[PDB]
Amino acid sequence: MHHHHHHSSGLVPRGSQEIEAKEACDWLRAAGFPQYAQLYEDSQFPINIVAVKNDHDFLEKDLVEPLCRRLNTLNKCASMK
Length: 81
Known about the structure:
It is built from 4 helices and no strands. With 81 residues, the chain is mostly helical. The chain has one domain: Helix Hairpins (Orthogonal Bundle). The protein starts with 16 loop residues before the first helix and ends with a helix.
């Protein structure tokens, strides 16, 4: 029943982009960064992804790929400025 996350990976893009949108928000929360997920419906996803991910927040760079990809997949739909 109780858990924190599933796994720490994400390298399989497909045409199912409307289903990837669900997994994007939920993965951000699971990975320990729910602030980013909640900012989707507030129209605050596009806030310099490459800058905020480069603040050296964790030691491992493998976590920075899905932090980029899950932001990017919703960015298309958000279209803010």
